[PDB]
């Protein structure tokens with residue numbers, strides 16, 4: 001599923017990402033935009049052999065098992081294909097663990113390089129929330 005901007009802000013808010021560990025909703029929507037273009041089906045291969053899955057591009061190196069990432073962890077204890085559903089629950093619930101692990105949103109390379117330090121509130125402008 002490809003979400004609209006405000007549609008995803010609302011889903012993220014419902015699942016408790018609004019200011020989760022101090023990251024305003026605009027951060028999360030910005031991260032989604034530049035990670036997946038709001039596409040729950042997005043998958044991308046990393047140079048190390050791991051793959052990033054779903055709307056927040058969660059990596060099989062650490063967070064999920066995709067059957068083909070040797071010597072990796074599965075810290076959200078899920079198959080990586082769970083992160084590709086049209087329901088974002090699994091991605092959100094795993095993102096909560098990732099962002100709580102000491103590195104905050106810096107775990108998302110697109111967030112660091114394209115959202116961090118920017119006027120992220122623009123990402124939720126005009127949405128009924």
Ligand SMILES: [Pt+2]
Pocket residue numbers: 011014087088089
């Ligand atoms: Pt939902």
Ligand SMILES: [Pt+2]
Pocket residue numbers: 014015016089092
């Ligand atoms: Pt939830």
